[PDB]
C-alpha cells in the first residue's frame, strides 16, 4: 500500500539484522511478561492436567538502525514472528505442546520496541481435586526462558494477573490469579534464572 | 546487548563448524546422562502405557576453536539446540513421540562443554497392574543412542535418579528410581551398545 | 557448572587462537569506545592534574571458529581479559599509570563480539584554575590506540558522554562531557591515527 | 506415522533376532491351528482333485526382548511374514502348490504372540464320486509340520472347523467339517509327528 | 573425535552422492526385511485397529566410491537417516501414520552395506474379536515398497518373525508370527510387486 | 539427493528393461482400474457430449531385477511415465483427445508394483437431455485396452466408483457412479476383451 | 543400479521442469480419478463422522522432453511425489486432515503419463444413524480440485467404485459404492467446477 | 538425462529411507483406493470364477525429507514399485494369484504423495449363473489390507466405480459397479479392519 | 560471445549430468514456489472454468561440479528449460492443458541454484457465480508435484501471493490472493504430499 511503509519493512527485514543479539554493550535484554487469563477450559481428574486459554504479552527492545532519515511515516509495522527473534519463554510443566490460537504477528516500533502477543492453550500439570469445594484448588506453572539465565534475560512484570478479559460464563470461577516473579537456581548451573510463577486459584462456580 | 558476547556467538556459529565430529584423534564422545523425574502424570490400564514428565540432563564436550584471543568475556552463551549437534539418545520403548516441555536452548561453555536439558513427557510401555497394591509396580525404559555403538558414544551417569524435584503431591509415590548403565548387544551388530535403564518403581500414594 | 558451558570455554581458549589478528581478509578492526564518567574525584592546583573515575566501554568483534555444532547453550561466557587480546587504547596525557577499579573480565559472545569494560582512575594533565568561577574549566584528554594507525584500528563512538552514571553528590558538577572522534597525524608517521577526545567541562557545585 | 510405533518395528526387526528358535529352555513351540473353510470351489472327477478356499489361523509365541522400556505405545504391529519365522505347516496331499489369496502380513504382539492368517486355495486329492448322492462324499487332508516332530512343534486346535464364514451360495453344501488332531508315526523316524486331519464331508446342494 | 573417522563421513556425505540410484548396471536393489515384534500394545474393538510395537530391520547395499585409499580406519559410521536414501517400505493398511520410537540413525559400512532399524508403533486394521477365545485371532499386514515394482526393488527375508524380543509380560500372547514374502499384482500396473505379509496370530494370555 | 536412491533409478532405468513384457511364464498382466470422479464439468446439448474430470488409478506389477543387494533404501521412486511402459486403457467413445491435468509421474515399488494416476478431462458422447428432470440422465463410457485381449491384459476393479473426491458444489449432482467390469466380444476378433463400463447417473442439483 | 535408468531420472528431474504446467497449447489437464474403497473402519454417532480407508488412483499426463535419444531402457521410473507436481484433489467435507497410509511414490512413464496412488484414511461428515437398519445409511463426499475450475482441470472416471478390494470381514457391509462425476457452480466463481461425488451406502453386516 | 532430476532420485532412494513408516506422530496412513473396471474377460460356470481386468488407483502420502534446497526442478519422478513401500491391499477371495498387466512403476511427488496404479487380471469366486437372464448376476469382492487394521491403515474412496474406461464391446454389460467402503471385524482380532467391497452387477449383452 | 561463458555452458551441459537427482546424501529437494497473479482473464459461467494469467516462480538447487577452476567469469547463464531437469508441479484441477506465455529459459547459478519462471494461462474449475455480488467469489487450485511425495520434494513459499504485478484495469478486482502450503494424503499412497493451495477471491470491479 504505502510506499513509505514498504521501505520501512524492507530496510529492517532485508538489511537490518540476522538472529543475533544486536546489543554489544553490557546490557541484558529484559522482557516484560504479562498474562491475560482468558479462560480455564477444562480439568481432567484422571490426567491431573488443566487447560488454560491465555494470551501472553511479551515486550522487548531490540536495537535497530535507521538508515534512511526517518520522516513522518508508518510508525509501527506488523510482521510475522518468524521474521524476528523471539524469546524462549516456555511453561516449565506443560503436559503437551502448547497450541497457538492466533497468528504469529508482532508489532514493531521505530524505537525498536516489539510487542508480541500469542494466544495459547496450554495443558499443565495440576490436581483438580477439590475444585467443587469452597476452598477451591490451586495450581502453579512457571514461565521463563529455558536456556537464558538471569544475566542474559531479565523478566519483568507490571501487575499480578489480568482477570478482566476472563470469560464471564466460564466453567470455573477465578478466586485469584497471581504472577509473581522469582529467581531460582538449578543444579545444572550456578547462574540464577528468573521465571514468573503463575499461580491461579479457581473453583467451579 | 554486549558486543563482546555477540562476537562469541557469531564466531562459533558462523566460522566454527558444521555437523561433523570435530574430534580427529581417537576419542569417543562421552555423554553424561541424568534423569530428573518430575512426575508420573498418568497410567493407562487398557493401554498399558505410563506417562513420565522428566527432564534429561545431557552433557558433552565438543571441540571448539578460539580464534580471537579470548578476553574476560561472556563465558557461557545460550543458543538454540538446532544450532549445534545433539545426541540421538532416545527411549527404546516409547509408545508415542515424546513431546517437548521446554524450548530447545543449550548453554555452551568456552571449554567446549555443552549442557542441554530438555523437558519431556514420554509415554512408554509398562503395565500399571497392581499399582494400588503395597508392593507397587515396576517399569523400565532404556535410553541410549539409537545408532551409536559404545565405540562412538559412551554414556555415563553420575547418580541413580533425581527424586528431589519430584512433585510432592503427585498421583503416584516413588518407591525408588534408578538409572543403571548397561551395555548390551543386538543381533544386528557385533558392536556393544550402551544404554541407561531407568527403572522406576512406584505406587499410588 | 554446566558441562555445555565448560566445553565452550575450553574450545575457544584451548583450540581457537593465539594473539594474532584472526581476520585474513582486508578488514580493519573497529573498536567502539564509550566513556561513562563516574566522577571527578580530585583536582590538584599545584600538580595541575585531575583525577577521573571512568569506566570504558570497549567493543570489538573477533573471528571465532565453531567446531562443535553449536546447540542451544551458554551464549556468553565470561573470561579474564588476559585470556584474549585487548586493544591498546590509552590516554595520551596521563600523568600516572592508571589504576584498575574492576577485575579484568570480559564477556564474549558466539558471534565473536566481545565486551570489555574496565573501571579506571586516571590522572591526566589539566589546569584546575578557575574551577570556582561560573565559567568553570575545561579539560581534554585523548584516548586512542598508541601503535595502531587508522588503517589497523578504527575507533567509533555511539554518543557524546554518559552523564547518567555520574555521582549525584560529586565534588564537581559536570557542565558538559563530550567525546568527539578525531583523526590526527603525527610527524612520526604518514598514517592517520584516530583518537577520541574526551573534553569535560566542569566546575565546583 | 507414529514415531513410537516406528521404534518398535525397528527394534524388533533390526536388533531382536535372526531365524533361530529364541527359546533356550526346554520348551517346544506349540502352534495353534484353525481352519476357516471359506468355500469348496471346484471338484474334478477325472483329476480326482478338489479345491478348497480356506484361511489358516496360525498362532505361536516367540520370545522377544524389550530393550527400551515399553511405554503405552503401539501394542500390535503388522509386518510382512518374510520378516519373521513362520511354521512349515503344509498339506500332506496337495496336488499342486497352494496359491496365496492374501498378502503375507502378520500381526505381532508385545507378549511375543504372533497371529498369521494366510488365505489359500488348495488342491488336494479326493474322489468327488457320489457328490450328488444324498450321502455325499468325504475327503481328508492332513496338515502338519513337514520336518518338525512332536517334540519340536506341538499342534493344538481350539475347535472342529469354522463353518460360519462358509459362502452361503457355494456350489457344494457342507455336511460337516472336522479338524481332529492326531499324532502319527512314519517309517522314516522314530519320533511322533502331529498333524491336524481336516475331514470335510460335503455334497452338492 | 577421530580425524580418520571424520574424513570418512565428509567424503561420503559431501562428495559421494545425491539421491539417485548409484547402480548403473542392470541390478535391482534388494532390501532384506525382518520384523522384530516387540509387543502388541493394544486392541480396539470398536475401532478394529491393533497396535504393534515393532522394529524393522532393513538392509541394503549402496554403491560408494573410495577416493582416499582406505587405511585401517573407522569401518562403520553412524549417520542420520536423512543423510542417505532409504526405502519406501510402508504398511499397506495402517490406520494412522506410524510413530517413530527411535532416532533415525543408520550404520553404514565400507562395502556400502547399510543397516537401518527404526522402531515403530503402528496401528493397522484388524478385528480383535475372539481374542479371548482359545483359538485366538489372526491379523495380517503387508509391508512393501509403495512405488517400487519387483523390478526396481526386491524384498528378501531371512526368517519368519523374531519372537525372542517379545515382551514377557505382554497383554497378548503370541501364538505365531510369520513373515511370508509374496509377489502380487495390482490393477494399476502390469509389474509384479513384492511385499512381506506379516501375519500375527495372538490371544490374551 | 540421496546416493542410495540415485543408484536405484539408474539401475532400473538404465540396465533393467526396454519396452517388452518382462514376464516369460504364462501370466497375463492384470491392471486394476479405479475411477475417482472429480467433477462433471459441462454438458453440451447440441453436441451431446459431456465432460468429466476424473483421475484414473492404474496399478500393475512389472518384473524387475534386483542386481545390487537391496539394503534399507529408497523403497519407492518416482519417475516420468515415459520412462516405463504404461497400459493402453482408453475411453471407447471419447469425442476428443483427452487432456492431461497432471504431470505424468508414476511411483514404482521394489516389488515391481507401479502406481500411475493421471488426471484427465474427457469428453464423451452422452445425451444431456432431461438433466433437469428428477429422474436425471444416464451416461456410460467404457474403458479398456484397445489392442489387448482378455488373454493379454486382465482388468480388475476394487469398487464401484469413488464419489468422495467429487466436488461439493459441482454443477451436477451425482445420483450414482458405477464401474462394472464386463467382458465383451467384437466381430474383429474371437478373443474376449475386458472393459470397465463407467455408468454415471447425474442430474442438475 | 542400472546406469541407463539413472540417466533417465536425472534428466527428467534435473533438466526437465519446475512446477509449471508444461502444456502451452490450449489443453486443460484431465485427471482420471478412481476410488478403491478398502474398508469402512469406523463410525462415530456422537461425532457423526465416518472413517474410510481408500486408495485413490490418479492419472494424468505431463509433457516431458526427450533429450537423449531414448533407447530400449527403463520405461517407468518411480520417484517421490514431492519431485513432481500433483493435483489438488481433496475431500470437500473432511472433518480432519487425511492421513497417508502409503509412501508418496509415483510411477512415471516415458509418454509422460503418471500414476500416483495414495492410500488414505479419511474422516468425513456423515450421520451413522440407522446403520443397523436393513435400509442402511448413505453418505456422500465429493472430491475435486479445490482451486481448479473445469477449465483448468477436468476430472474423469472409468467406473462407479472398486468393491473388489473391500475387506471381506469389514465391520460394515457395502450395499453400493458409486462415483458419479458432476459439475457444479459456487457463488464465488462463475466457472464450473467438477468433482466426483462418492456416495457409499453401507450397513452393519 | 537431466542432472537435476538425477540428484532427486538418488537423494530419495539412497539417503531418504528404508522400509519403515516414516511418520512418528500419531497418524495412520490413509490410502485412497479407486477401481477402474476395464473389462469382465471371462466367466467359468463349472469353476464359478470370474475374471476381471482392472487397474487399481492407489494413493498415499509418505514423509520425505528435502535435503538439498529444492529448486524449480523435476517435480515428479517415476520409479519402480520395488524401490518404495507399497500397501498390502489384496482381494479377499481371489481364486488365483493375480497377474500384473503393467510394469510396476510409481510416480512420486515432492510433497511425498505417491500414485501407483497397477493393472491386474483377477480371478475371484462368483457364480455366473443367470448371467443370461435380464436380472443378471451380482458378484462381490472385497479389497483391503490383509494385515493392517483400521488403526494402521485407513482406506478411502472418491467415487463408486469407474465405468468410463470399460470396453465398449465387452462380452458382458455392466449394470452397475459399486465400491462401498466398509469396516468389519474378524474373530482373530478385536481391531476393526476396513475394506472396499467392489460389487459388480453385470450380464451378457 | 564470451569464451569464458562458452566454456561454462558446455561444461555443465556436456559433462555435468543427465536426468538424475545428483544428490546422493539424504536430502530431499525443496522447491520454492511463488505465484505472481498477472490477471484473471476470463470467467465462463456455463463452463464454470476461470482463466488465470500467472507466472510461476520456481527455485531449486541442483548439485553441480566445478571442473575448471572457476575464475571471475559469467556467474549466471541462461539455458533452455529442456536442457535441465524441472519439477513436475502442476495444477490439480486444470480443465485444459496450460499454455505457455514465455519461452522456456532458466537462469542457473554457480552455486547450482536455478530460477525458472514460466508464464502460464491456466483454466481451472471454479464457479463464477456471484462474481457481481459484493461478497465476490472464491476459487481454489492446488499446485504440487504430481508424483513426488513430501519425502522426495518439499515445497516452500516465501509469501501469500504477489498482487503488485496484477493488471490495474483487469476485468476482475482481487479481493485477496493467498498461497497456503498444505500437506495432504491420498488414498493411493501412505506418503504425505505437499501442495500449495492458491485461493483467490475476486469480484468484478
Residue numbers in the entry:
A (entry chain C), B (entry chain D), C (entry chain D), D (entry chain B), E (entry chain E), F (entry chain A), ...: 1 to 205
What does the report in the manuscript say about this coordinate set?
We docked twelve copies of the homology-modeled BgAChBP1 pentamer into the 6-Å cryo-EM structure. Comparable results were obtained with the BgAChBP2 pentamer (not shown). In BgAChBP2, the putative disulfide bridge C16↔C64 is lacking, but residues D25, R63 and E70 are conserved. R2, R3, D26 are substituted for K2, K3, E26, but these isofunctional exchanges suggest the same role in inter-pentamer binding. Instead of phenylalanine F71, the single cysteine C71 is present in BgAChBP2. The only possibility for this covalent dimerization exists via C71↔C71, since the other four cysteines in BgAChBP2 form the canonical disulfide bridges in loop L7 and loop L10. In silico, we assembled a BgAChBP2 homo-dodecahedron, with three C71 in the center of each vertex (not shown). However, such a particle might not exist in vivo, because we could not produce it from recombinant BgAChBP2. Recombinant BgAChBP2 formed many pentamers, indicating that the protein refolding was successful, while rosette-like particles were completely absent. Alternatively, BgAChBP2 might exclusively form di-pentamers, with C71↔C71 bridges as covalent linkers.
